[PDB]
Ligand binder design. Structure first.
Ligand code: OLC
Ligand code: OLC
Ligand code: OLC
Ligand code: OLC
Ligand code: OLC
Ligand code: OLC
Ligand code: OLC
Ligand code: OLC
Ligand code: OLC
Length: 522
């Protein structure tokens, strides 16, 4: 069963990792708030935060491991050290020159990414400085992602799954203990990121030495295998990470809005990163390997059947989560962030961006299902072309929404674009005659919609009997939040079982048995 790969140890490590990342953002919100200095940091954190997410969500492993597994097995450990050396060298060289260039041209990078910060000479100079300190992370996090994939190919798993923790450990310790000794104190966060990057790599190196895969990076532009790996890294991200690239571009527009517009968008996107990340990783861990296996063997039925099951798991979990985040946007922002320098105005500005983001949770998760359907057949070009159309239309919605809705309209542009990205991938899988659904989708969706209203009704009613969400310290707020969340989860799954949906049966679908057997026992 393909579902035995989710509860394979790291299930308690997804928990520890998500909790500790929450703990970082809560601590950052307390000590630094959502203003000038966090604005500057969150701009300089944009590209690092994008790469961290790839390594924490195991995305590069999902891509590199099949390449390295194929070419360890057919043609050798001795040749695989060489391949890794050539892959490692290209990554290092390419990213070393980018990092150095970006550090010496840091003010000009901010002129492109946050031009509205040029009205504020002191805010601009700080952003440039923070970006200079955090560039080396881009190299550091990329080598760590490669190292983690080598370990994962050799079936270690636990050491690379833990390394993402180290960044949040670094930033928490710096924010709590080192920040007073810096001026301005946000400089501690920047150094914490680069130190976190050093730790995320150095943590994994000794275990690589044990498997004989610690090789000194070298350059050889004639290795076509090394060139395709690095060259198709970007296009592969772009086809599955348009929302995250749109945050970076929206920063241009947000640089002209009120103080904290960048921060309010950051905190709202982290809150949504929880259902996005957890569900996206789980769906990816199950889909891409098995779908690639079926495509390799011509198993058209099991390709099509796992496709349909995953897209039903998608709507089953994303739709209630999306509505729940919207309904609970206020309670979530007050209970998790409204402490210290993060005020109730900050909480409302974060809530409004979250409600906008909420519209696109379902699209983000459908993309995590539909893009693999192309990637399994070695078609990057179709998701990439869709990605480019989506980026262009996101920026057009910015021009339409920034007026009335400010930073929330820039958030909504990302939300509606994920729904667009997903529907363009479905239309392409149907026109190209690759996926055709199983029967009963309309009945399946209608029971979900009814169960979601039931959940919403219980959610809204629970919010009415509860006090103001700022009442009490953090334990009391969180305890009340868990009472409202448990009531929603219970109502949602209670309504599905009344309407006749078997969650337990859904997890024992026959396609899951044979897909797991066909993939694990290759
Ligand atoms: C609201 C506005 C919506 C606008 C929507 C715009 C259209 C989006 C479609 C993209 C075409 C994708 C086609 C991808 C390539 C198909 C051709 C093909 O199969 O080429 C493979 C090639 O041979 C490999 O080398
Ligand atoms: C890659 C190169 C990027 C750089 C090159 C392109 C730069 C485009 C900047 C546009 C400003 C957008 C923000 C507009 C500032 C005013 C804020 C606003 O829209 O407020 C609404 C209205 O003024 C009251 O309701
Ligand atoms: C399944 C659907 C039903 C679910 C049923 C869940 C039961 C537990 C709920 C507790 C509500 C708590 C109410 C108020 C909690 C805060 C108490 C407080 O101090 O509020 C201020 C006070 O009214 C003046 O001082
Ligand atoms: C503007 C001032 C930029 C100063 C640093 C530029 C070169 C980077 C060196 C450190 C990174 C490699 C170790
Ligand atoms: C590793 C996670 C915990 C790390 C946190 C503990 C402090 C470490 C360093 C302090 C440097 C102080 C620099 C003082 C300011 C110079 C300007
Ligand atoms: C510049 C400073 C950082 C350099 C990091 C180099 C990576 C080490 C070996 C890992 C890849 C080969 C195995
Ligand atoms: C609830 C969310 C709406 C989701 C709607 C998703 C259903 C779309 C149905 C659809 O497009 O059917 C396939 C196509 O029409 C045949 O080629
Ligand atoms: C606010 C919510 C916005 C949501 C936006 C999400 C867009 C995702 C795009 C496509 C997914 C379609 C899902 C699958 C629908 C298949 C329907 C169909 O054709 O059913 C055939 C039937 O089962 C007989 O074979
Ligand atoms: C299981 C239900 C969850 C929480 C109970 C809600 C009541 C507890 C939280 C609200 C009470 C509170 O925070 O009280 C502050 C202060 O201690 C008063 O004097």
């Amino acid at each position: 069963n393909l579902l035995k790969s989710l509860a394979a140890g790291r299930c308690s490590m997804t928990m520890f990792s998500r909790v500790l990342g929450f703990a970082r953002d809560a601590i950052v919100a307390r000590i630094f708030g959502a203003g000038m200095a966090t604005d500057a940091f969150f701009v300089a954190f944009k590209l690092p935060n994008l790469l961290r997410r790839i390594f924490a969500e195991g995305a590069f492993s999902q891509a590199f491991v099949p390449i390295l597994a194929e070419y360890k097995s057919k043609q050798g450990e001795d040749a695989t050290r060489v391949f890794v050396s050539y892959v490692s060298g290209l990554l290092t060289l390419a990213l070393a020159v980018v990092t150095v260039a970006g550090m010496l041209a840091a003010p000009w990078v901010i002129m492109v990414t946050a031009p509205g910060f040029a009205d504020t000479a002191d805010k601009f100079a700080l952003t440039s400085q923070l970006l200079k300190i955090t560039f080396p992370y881009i190299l550091l996090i990329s080598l760590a992602s490669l190292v983690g994939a080598i370990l994962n190919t050799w079936n270690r798993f636990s050491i690379p799954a833990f390394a993402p923790t180290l960044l949040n450990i670094s930033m928490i310790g710096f924010a709590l203990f080192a920040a007073p000794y810096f001026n301005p104190p946000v400089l501690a966060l920047a150094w914490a990121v680069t130190v976190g990057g050093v730790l995320q790599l150095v943590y994994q190196l000794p275990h690589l030495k044990k498997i004989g895969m610690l090789v000194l990076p070298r350059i050889n532009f004639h290795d076509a295998g090394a060139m395709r790996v690095v060259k198709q890294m970007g296009p592969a991200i772009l086809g599955v990470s348009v929302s995250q690239i749109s945050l970076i571009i929206n920063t241009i527009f947000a640089s002209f809005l009120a103080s904290g517009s960048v921060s309010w968008m950051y905190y709202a996107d982290r809150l949504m990163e929880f259902p996005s990340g957890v569900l996206g990783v789980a769906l990816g861990t199950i889909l891409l390997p098995s779908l690639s296996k079926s495509f390799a063997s011509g198993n058209h039925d099991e390709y099509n059947r796992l496709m349909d099951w995953g897209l039903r798991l998608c709507f089953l979990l994303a739709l209630p989560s999306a509505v729940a985040l919207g309904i609970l946007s206020g309670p979530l922002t007050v209970s998790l962030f409204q402490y210290g320098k993060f005020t109730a105005f900050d909480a409302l500005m974060t809530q409004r961006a979250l409600i906008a983001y909420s519209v696109g949770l379902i699209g983000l998760i459908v993309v995590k299902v539909l893009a693999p359907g192309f990637y399994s057949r070695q078609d990057i070009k179709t998701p990439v072309k869709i990605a480019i159309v989506t980026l262009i239309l996101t920026q057009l919605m910015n021009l339409a929404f920034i007026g009335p809705l400010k930073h929330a309209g820039l958030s909504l542009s990302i939300g509606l674009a994920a729904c667009l990205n997903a529907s363009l991938l479905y239309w392409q899988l149907r026109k190209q005659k690759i996926f055709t659904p199983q029967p009963g989708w309309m009945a399946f969706l209608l029971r979900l919609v009814v169960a979601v209203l039931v959940m919403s009704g219980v959610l809204l009613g629970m919010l009415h009997i509860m006090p103001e969400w700022s009442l009490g310290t953090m334990p009391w707020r969180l305890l009340r939040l868990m009472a409202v969340v448990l009531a929603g989860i219970a109502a949602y799954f209670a309504a599905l079982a009344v309407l006749g949906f078997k969650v337990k049966e859904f997890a024992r679908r026959t396609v899951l048995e044979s897909s797991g057997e066909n993939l694990y026992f290759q």
